[PDB]
Design a protein around this ligand. Structure first.
Ligand SMILES: O=P(O)(O)O[C@H]1[C@@H](OP(=O)(O)O)[C@@H](OP(=O)(O)O)[C@@H](OP(=O)(O)O)[C@@H](OP(=O)(O)O)[C@H]1OP(=O)(O)O
Lengths: 375, 133, 141, 216
RNA sequence: AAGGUAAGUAU
RNA sequence: ACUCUGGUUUCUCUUCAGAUCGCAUAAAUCUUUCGCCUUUUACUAAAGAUUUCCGUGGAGAGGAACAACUCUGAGUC
């Protein structure tokens, strides 16, 4: 526990630089100044029960917003169906993971407030109040099981156990019993306060989304950008106010040009204007460069070990085949133009060595297929 | 029926006779209110204005730096579209709707001929050289 | 480059879907400027020539026609609703929402098979139909 | 002696009357307004131009004559086209289409031409495989650049003393050069293995990385 | 959290 | 020993962050690797770069409250 908590502390110490040159816009003070809210003074327990009632109202509206009575949230912030929910009704009554987090945190604050309420209304003494506070702060994982609601919260709860591990260790260090009588809740209380402070932006954003009324693409994106930009440039140059149909047929040549590049076959269209041909050449050179780049990049990704899909693998294989076919084409052309690379008299020397070795072996060379053969 | 006006006075959702595809709750939304919405939006804007200026300046600087490395798609052919209008009207009108350097192979042929001649000359030393008929 | 027919008005899409006979009306909700939706539109364009006999594709813009956003819960990109025979079909492909395809198909042939299966199911009269390829897994490995 | 001997040997001077021509997106009215504002006015650059940088034309996207490989050999006049072709350049990578209007005023006795075949595309840097097609003989680009400078530049017959050409793929590539002794004119390859190679042997066929010539 | 709504038929 | 010297509590408002903004410490997105791997919610765990988020300081401004008590240095004292 000590080693793990020291790890957490040192990781906190590593990344510590605030860029936050804020304008000191006190949003809370502005909300206080808003006419929709007013200020007063009241006891902390009264504020706690007010917040519990407000959270229950929040969950009540969030649940029965679509007039669905399938799911019911109890006053203890535990959701429960009113009957054996139908599978279609179960699909209808479903909430996201962040809603699970919100319900869990509301449950935690409600149970803390109710514990202080029962303490104030006599019942159990204050020593046990502190002990129960300590336990709840260091057993939220067991109490609420945030694991499913959020995986990261597990870290908080597990470290809370670690701090509690130390707290009880020291509390029960000597004459103090080895029982559950430990009361140092602040150590986990601060951690839970920090984690809640980190979480609350998400809950606020989602609650605002509900309160409002609006509650593999990179290669495809670049291809669409290329084709759309070229089409828009053509429609700017080509007077759509006069000619309409032929522009669509223009796209055909685009595709033709593209496949004319893929097949590595000559492409000449005398009917098309020369500036149009130049624009097509620029488009096809950009597309070919991008296509080869992404082809070799995806091939490298596949061979490295990255997981790929069947269609993506087939497309990458096709692109690699096309690229290799092209490359072999200019390689053969370069061999034809530059001639054989066998140096003069060097292949002759190799042949002389071979024939000398064969003569040393002194074997009869294989003749033409005879009329009569053994088998 | 593309290109037709929509007769007003009828709700498209109700007239078609469709059923509410309730995929999942809490996934869809399902004047004093206007004034409250305006006030809350103003409060949200006030809260967000704490870091807006510096973030916007940094984003603008980053975008400007990114543009130099690689500009927009239409930027690579801005000159071409500038010169695109130079084509005559009759040029694109008749667009077909249907879809020096000597013989470098001479050096290769000479090299191949020289190699073949050298091999044929070396074939004389091959006492056991054989052919077919 | 997004040359498929698009519903300028919301009511126009409604009557276009209503004006169907022995054909499947694939209404692709979303926005053309989205990149994933651009890929989906390109796939639909590729399919359109091959299956134009019974499959008609008719895109629409959420901003242009927001009245149908809440009707079928249109709050994701690349959404596709096979509104065929004036009946929203139940296409099940191993997903939670078995009435909406909200991501561009990896391959065109898969989309062609899906749309022809939808046509067969609609012609048979059933309101639900399954897919030969389950999409619960993306076959990433 | 501010003018360094190495610098002054290959200094040069280009009187590029650079014009800040309006951006292509500017309409005809905006172009007229900019012209009235002297935006497109030619301004002399007086560029040092220590070594001339001549860029090869566009690569052949589709091979027409021979589908296996099309080599668009660039005539040596393209380098000599800098008198007017560079003076007619109206292109820039910025938003405004800058008109270079390059005009080489004083040609240095040593001419170092850089082909700059390598160029970065939108994804990767590629090299144009176009043949150099540059004969090794007298040149008249200095007279073309400035007709009156012919009196000052009496020895305009410059022979390509040393030409270096890259070879292989852009990633794993090498270089090979051929140089001629001044006066002797051996024109031999500087490669250690091929020490003696006088004939061009399709020297201009390869993409010559750079050339160096003397006015003599 | 989920990846687990059979559709059909008129009320 | 003589003349001028002149508040601190506060409330907000607008800027700038140097300063371990904070002798405390979260979260979100994106990016590269690691366990990855069964699709997203997610993860594991580190790095890199942002953002929100709890807070704070400097500086300036405007009212209230102690504004009349001066603190204090200067004024050869
Ligand atoms: O389950 P673990 O984390 O291993 O710890 C538990 C338990 O902890 P929880 O109360 O958090 O479940 C007790 O701890 P406390 O009751 O002291 O809080 C108990 O401890 P005591 O016996 O001291 O009561 C005991 O630990 P141990 O028996 O080792 O002292 C036990 O651990 P085990 O499950 O390993 O027995």
């Amino acid at each position: 526990s000590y080693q793990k908590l020291l790890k957490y502390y040192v990781l906190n110490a590593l990344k510590h630089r605030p860029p936050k040159a804020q304008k000191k816009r006190y949003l809370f003070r502005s909300f206080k100044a808003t006419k929709f809210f007013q200020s007063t003074k009241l006891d902390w327990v009264e504020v706690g029960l007010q917040v519990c009632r407000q959270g229950y109202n929040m969950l009540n509206l969030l649940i029965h917003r679509k007039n669905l009575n399938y799911l019911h949230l109890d006053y203890n912030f535990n959701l429960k169906p009113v009957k054996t929910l139908t599978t279609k009704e179960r699909k209808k009554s479903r909430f996201g993971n962040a809603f699970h987090l919100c319900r869990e945190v509301l449950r935690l604050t409600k149970l803390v407030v109710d514990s202080h309420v029962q303490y104030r209304l006599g019942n159990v003494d204050a020593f046990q109040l502190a002990d129960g506070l300590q336990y709840i702060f260091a057993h939220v994982g067991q109490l609420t099981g945030m694991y499913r609601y959020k995986y990261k919260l597990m870290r908080q709860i597990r470290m809370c156990k670690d701090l509690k591990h130390l707290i009880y260790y020291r509390f029960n260090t000597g004459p103090v019993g080895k029982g559950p009588g430990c009361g140092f809740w602040a150590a986990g209380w601060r951690v839970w306060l920090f984690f809640m402070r980190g979480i609350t932006p998400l809950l606020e954003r989602w609650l605002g989304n509900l309160l409002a009324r609006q509650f593999q693409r990179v290669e495809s994106h670049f291809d669409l950008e290329l084709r759309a930009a070229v089409m828009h440039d053509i429609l700017d140059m080509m007077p759509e106010g006069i000619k309409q149909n032929k522009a669509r047929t223009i796209l055909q040549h685009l595709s033709e040009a593209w496949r004319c590049w893929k097949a590595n076959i000559p492409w000449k269209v005398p009917g098309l204007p020369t500036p149009i041909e130049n624009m097509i050449l620029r488009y096809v050179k950009a597309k070919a460069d991008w296509w080869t780049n992404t082809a070799h990049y995806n091939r490298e990704r596949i061979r490295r070990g990255a997981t790929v899909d069947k269609t993506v693998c087939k497309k990458n294989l096709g692109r690699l085949t096309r690229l290799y076919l092209k490359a072999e084409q200019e390689r053969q052309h370069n061999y034809l133009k530059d001639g054989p690379y066998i140096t003069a008299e060097e292949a002759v020397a190799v042949y002389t060595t071979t024939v000398h070795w064969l003569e040393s072996r002194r074997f009869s060379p294989i003749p033409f297929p005879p009329l009569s053969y053994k088998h | 029926f593309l290109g037709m006006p929509a007769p007003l006075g009828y709700v498209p959702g109700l007239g078609r006779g469709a059923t509410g595809f309730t995929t999942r709750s809490d996934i869809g939304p399902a004047k004093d209110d206007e004034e409250a919405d305006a006030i809350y939006a103003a409060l949200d804007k006030r809260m967000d204005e704490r870091r807006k200026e510096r973030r916007e300046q940094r984003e603008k600087e980053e975008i400007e730096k990114y543009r130099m490395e690689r500009p927009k798609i239409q930027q690579q052919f801005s000159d071409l579209k500038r010169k695109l209008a130079e084509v005559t009207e009759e040029e694109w009108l008749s667009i077909p709707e249907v879809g020096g350097e000597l013989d470098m192979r001479k050096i290769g042929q000479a090299r191949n001929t020289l190699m073949d001649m050298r091999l044929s000359q070396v074939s004389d030393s091959v006492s056991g050289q054989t052919v077919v008929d | 480059s997004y040359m498929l027919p698009h519903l300028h008005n919301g009511w126009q899409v409604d009557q276009a879907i209503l004006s169907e006979e022995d054909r499947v009306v694939v209404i692709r909700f979303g926005h053309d400027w989205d990149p994933t939706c651009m890929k989906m539109d390109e796939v639909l364009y590729s399919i359109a020539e091959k299956v134009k006999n019974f499959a008609v594709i008719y895109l629409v813009d959420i901003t242009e026609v927001p009245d149908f956003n809440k009707m079928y819960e249109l709050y994701d990109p690349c959404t596709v609703m096979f509104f065929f025979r004036n009946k929203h079909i139940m296409i099940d492909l191993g997903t939670g929402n078995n009435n909406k395809i909200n991501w561009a198909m990896e391959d065109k042939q898969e989309m062609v098979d899906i749309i022809e299966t939808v046509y067969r199911g609609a012609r048979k009269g059933r309101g639900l139909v399954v897919s030969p390829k389950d999409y619960s897994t993306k076959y990433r490995y | 002696k501010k003018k360094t001997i190495v610098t002054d040997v290959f200094q040069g001077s280009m009187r590029i009357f650079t014009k800040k021509l309006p951006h292509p997106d500017l309409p005809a009215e905006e172009k007229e307004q900019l012209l009235h504002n002297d935006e497109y006015q030619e301004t002399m650059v007086e560029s040092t131009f220590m070594y001339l940088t001549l860029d090869l034309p566009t690569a052949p996207l589709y091979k027409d004559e021979k589908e296996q490989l099309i080599i668009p050999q660039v005539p040596l006049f393209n380098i000599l086209a800098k008198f007017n072709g560079i003076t007619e350049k109206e292109y820039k990578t910025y938003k405004e289409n800058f008109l270079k209007r390059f005009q080489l005023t004083k040609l240095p006795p040593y001419l170092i031409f850089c082909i700059k075949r390598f160029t970065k595309n939108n994804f990767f840097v590629e090299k144009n495989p176009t043949i150099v097609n540059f004969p090794i003989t007298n040149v008249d680009l200095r007279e073309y650049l400035s007709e009156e400078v012919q009196a000052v530049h009496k020895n305009t017959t410059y022979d390509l003393i040393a030409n270096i050409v890259h070879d292989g793929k852009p990633s794993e590539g090498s270089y090979r050069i051929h140089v001629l002794h001044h006066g002797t004119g051996k024109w031999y390859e500087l490669q250690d293995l091929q020490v003696t190679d006088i004939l061009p042997q399709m020297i201009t066929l390869s993409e010559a990385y750079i050339q160096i010539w003397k006015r003599r």
